[PDB]
Amino acid sequence: SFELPALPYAKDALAPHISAETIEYHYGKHHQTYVTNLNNLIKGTAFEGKSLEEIIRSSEGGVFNNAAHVWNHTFYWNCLAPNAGGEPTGKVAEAIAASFGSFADFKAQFTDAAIKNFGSGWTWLVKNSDGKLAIVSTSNAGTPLTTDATPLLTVDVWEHAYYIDYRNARPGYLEHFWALVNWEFVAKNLAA
Amino acid sequence: SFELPALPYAKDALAPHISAETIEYHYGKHHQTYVTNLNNLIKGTAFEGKSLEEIIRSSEGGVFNNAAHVWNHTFYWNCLAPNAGGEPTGKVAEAIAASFGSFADFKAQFTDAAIKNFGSGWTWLVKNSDGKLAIVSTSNAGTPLTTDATPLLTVDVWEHAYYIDYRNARPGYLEHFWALVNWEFVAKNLAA
Ligand SMILES: [Fe+3]
Ligand SMILES: [Fe+3]
């Protein structure tokens, strides 16, 4: 039985970038529901004893949608943090500069892809199997886990992720997303 | 040059089922933006001068997404109305009963499909080339116009259509949607 991992911080820790109200709905209702959905769908199936990643790589339809959504959201919450954001340093900074030229270029490209992601979806910074970094976007519950690329950072662009706080202004949401990036988590993802 | 058609009723005419704030954003900002996006994208091209339908039936990428979105939204605004909703009578009532057995059955199935539509999309009631009615759903900006089916009724299930008024409660949104259905429009679409 899967459970909703506890948020990594206080419900109001991401304010004003992401409100406590958005956390209440996005984490407390949406994410929670995906967990319940998954448990319901895999009950009595061969998926029961499998890890989240394992189910994501061997399922389709509702099972896949909910499994991928549970994983994507948990990853998303860890990509955010209070007293973070800004420009990265250390290994992450070097890696980003090596693949995109500079952080500024990376940022613009990431923001552009996230804003251009049509409909519901996710935009990611990944580390390809060849060690190089790249920006890719997925639709709906899609995830880089079904490929050989390693997710390092993500932004949820389903409208529920920002409508309470930004309405249709996805660009404003992205702007504030940058002020919340947990580069420590990104570094851990990169060094793994 | 395409323009945003005027709303068929006052901004607060659909309340409390759909708020004036939702119209302010959904119609005033979202819809308006697809219109501008479309004009910018086709200026100086062979699409300039064509009708929405013609562009929708001969484009792809951003031109299609916006042309389809403009058409879909104007159609949606016409599917709603104050002092309407309820159960239909006349031609629409007969057609629905003939294809679904009873309005009750139709209503349940249309609602189910709309709630199941994963991600952003639209759920429609259409009349196939054989004259029979059917319920079909499209993703993102997809529309029945790219098929041989004739759209009769539609419900927008992109989260921006209901998040302000219902947050994650799409079922509640659908409940109130029925209270707004403009059967006069549906009848006009059916008899065309
Ligand atoms: Fe989400
Ligand atoms: Fe819409």
CA of A184 to the centre of ligand 2 (A): 37
Gap between the terminal Cα atoms of chain B:
26
For B32, the closest chain A residue by CA position comes to: A168
Q: What is the CA radius of gyration of chain B?
A: 16
User: What are the start-end ranges of the H helices in chain A?
Assistant: 20-25, 32-42, 52-56, 61-78, 90-100, 103-116, 163-166, 170-178, 183-191
CA–CA dist B170, B108 (Å, integer)? 14
Query: What resolution (Å)?
Result: 1.8
Tell me which chain A residues have a C-beta less than 8 angstroms from the C-beta of B140.
118-119
- Which has the closest alpha carbon to A69: A145, A141, A130? A141
Q: Is B3 left (phi over 0), alpha (psi -120 to 50) or beta?
A: beta
Long-range Cβ pairs for the range A47-56 (8 Å, 24+): A52/A2, A53/A145, A56/A143, A56/A145, A56/A146
Residue contact B140–A119, C-beta within 8 A:
yes
What does residue B36 show for φ and ψ, rounded to 5 degrees? -65, -45
- Which has the closest alpha carbon to B64: B93, B95, B29, B38? B38
Q: Nearest by CB to A163, which of B65, B121, B163?
A: B163
User: What are the start-end ranges of the H helices in B84-162?
Assistant: 90-100, 103-116
CA–CA dist A137, A115 (Å, integer)? 10
Is residue B17 part of an annotated ligand binding site? no
- Which has the closest alpha carbon to A150: A179, A182, A187? A187
Interface A:B, Cβ pairs < 8 A: 52
Residue B65 structural domain: 1-192
What does residue A11 show for φ and ψ, rounded to 5 degrees? -55, -30
CA of A73 to the centre of ligand 1 (A): 6
- Which has the closest alpha carbon to B161: B178, B148, B173, B145? B173
Query: Looking at chain A, how many residues does it have?
Result: 192
Residues with Cβ < 8 Å from B103, sequence gap 6 or more?
Answer: B87, B88, B93, B96, B97
CA–CA dist A30, A20 (Å, integer)? 14
- Could you tell me if B137 and B124 are in contact, meaning their C-beta atoms sit under 8 angstroms apart? yes
Cα B135 → chain centroid: 13
- Which has the closest alpha carbon to B36: B79, B70, B6? B70
* Per-position b or e across B70-94, b if 16+ CB within 10 A of its CB: bbbbbbbbbbbbbebbeebeeebee
Long-range Cβ pairs for the range B18-25 (8 Å, 24+): B18/B80, B18/B162, B18/B165, B18/B176, B18/B180, B19/B164, B19/B165, B21/B164, B21/B165, B22/B161, B22/B162, B22/B164, B22/B165, B25/A167, B25/A168, B25/B160, B25/B164
Beta bridge pairs of residue A122: A138, A156
The full 3-state SS of A26-59, as one line of letters, equals: HHHHHHHHHHHHHHHHHCCCCCCCCCHHHHHCCC
Per DSSP bridges, beta strands A150-156 and B133-139 are unpaired
The distance of A116 to chain B (nearest Cα, Å) reads 10
CA of A68 to the centre of ligand 1 (A): 11
CA–CA dist A146, A170 (Å, integer)? 27
CA–CA dist A82, A180 (Å, integer)? 6
Is residue A73 part of an annotated ligand binding site? yes
CA–CA dist B106, B19 (Å, integer)? 26
Q: Is B65 on the interface with A (CB under 8 A)?
A: yes
A192 burial (CB, 10 Å; 0-12 / 13-18 / 19+) is exposed
- Could you tell me if A41 and A49 are in contact, meaning their C-beta atoms sit under 8 angstroms apart? no
**∠ CA A57-A59-A64 to the nearest 5 degrees?**
95
Q: How many domains does chain B have?
A: 1
Q: How far is CA B174 from CA A155, B136, B155, B168, B169, in A?
A: 28, 16, 8, 12, 9
- Which has the closest alpha carbon to A65: A149, A150, A160, A146? A146
- Could you tell me if B189 and B150 are in contact, meaning their C-beta atoms sit under 8 angstroms apart? yes
Sign of the CA dihedral running A3, A114, B70, B130: negative
- Could you tell me if B56 and B64 are in contact, meaning their C-beta atoms sit under 8 angstroms apart? yes
Residues with Cβ < 8 Å from B18, sequence gap 6 or more?
Answer: B80, B162, B165, B176, B180
Residue contact A118–B139, C-beta within 8 A:
no
Q: Concatenated DSSP letters for B8-62?
A: SS-TTTTTTTS-HHHHHHIIIIIIHHHHHHHHHHHTTSTTTT--HHHHHTT--HH
CA–CA dist A96, A89 (Å, integer)? 10
